[PDB]
């Protein structure tokens, strides 16, 4: 287990780390998109709380994203899927901040657990979609793969899309969007990327995640212990030992960090307008 570094404590330390470090891993969760208008999973107004209400027939809200339940009955998921399908939201200040870090070559990687694709919209390139996305779908039985456009219609009509290859009378021959469900493997990209990154990372920043789900939650314990770790989150994570704890809205906290950093980071915050010559 990783113990906290005693020589890294203050927000001033955090800023200096951000100035000097050149191989930063940023690990993000649903928190970074709530300001965009996308609720998280585990908060009072989150996805799981809403599921407990709108789908009370489930053993528990997690069953909606559980592979063993999905195989038993995929109808709930496809009634609900269109609600979490990537809409037309704009990236938050935090996405833009990560994009700038990448643009400046300081971002080793952004591991995101989100499926809202806001990282792409923000122009972050060195990203890993730890928990997949709606970009493709795959038959549960034969593994036939299709693009999202092939099943999009069925999703927005709340019907279970069928495999076109498998027998037309095969009940489990359905096209599951390649989002990672409980009991499923994460994409191979994740594992390869982590093997490359763990001995390279010189700073870890966790933003807007409860880190309650493995293997993503294992990242902080799987990198070298001396690597500094910063948390930016509404709630502390008692099961881990971060060096600096910045608690509150990530956009508020990132905004403050951007101003201390100056340069292009300060310019990222265009509202309100800063003093400048016309």
């Amino acid at each position: 287990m990783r113990k906290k570094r005693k020589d890294i404590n203050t927000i001033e330390d955090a800023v200096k780390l951000l100035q000097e470090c050149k191989k930063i891993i940023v690990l993000t969760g649903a928190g970074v998109s709530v300001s965009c208008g996308i609720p998280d999973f585990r908060s009072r107004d989150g996805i799981y709380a809403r599921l407990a209400v709108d789908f009370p027939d489930l053993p528990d809200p997690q069953a909606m994203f559980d592979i063993e339940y999905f195989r038993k009955d995929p109808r709930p998921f496809f009634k609900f899927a269109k609600e979490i399908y990537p809409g037309q939201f704009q990236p938050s200040l935090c996405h833009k901040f990560i994009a700038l870090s990448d643009k400046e070559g300081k971002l080793l990687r952004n591991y995101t657990q989100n499926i809202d694709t806001l990282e792409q919209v923000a122009g972050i390139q060195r990203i890993i979609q730890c928990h997949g996305s709606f970009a493709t779908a795959s038959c549960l039985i034969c593994k036939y793969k299709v693009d999202c456009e092939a099943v999009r219609g069925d999703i927005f009509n709340q019907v279970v899309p069928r495999c076109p290859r498998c027998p037309a009378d095969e009940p489990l021959a359905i096209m599951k969007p390649e989002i990672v469900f409980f009991g499923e493997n994460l994409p191979e990209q994740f594992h390869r990327a982590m093997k490359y990154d763990k001995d390279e990372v010189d700073l870890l920043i966790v933003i807007g995640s409860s880190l309650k789900v493995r293997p993503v939650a294992l990242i902080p314990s799987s990198i070298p212990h001396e690597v500094p770790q910063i948390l930016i989150n509404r709630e502390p994570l008692p099961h881990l030992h971060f060096d600096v704890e910045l608690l509150g809205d990530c956009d508020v906290i990132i905004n403050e960090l951007c101003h201390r950093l100056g340069g292009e980071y300060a310019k990222l915050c265009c509202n309100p307008v800063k003093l400048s010559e016309i």
Binding site: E235, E245, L246, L247, G248, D249, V252, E256
Partner: peptide, 26 residues
Amino acid sequence: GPHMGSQYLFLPPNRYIFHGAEVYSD
């Protein structure tokens, strides 16, 4: 931004509390 969005509450040695922190709820 929010009320006093630039100010934080410091719990030494390394915890900073900003607007939006869950500790303000209940």
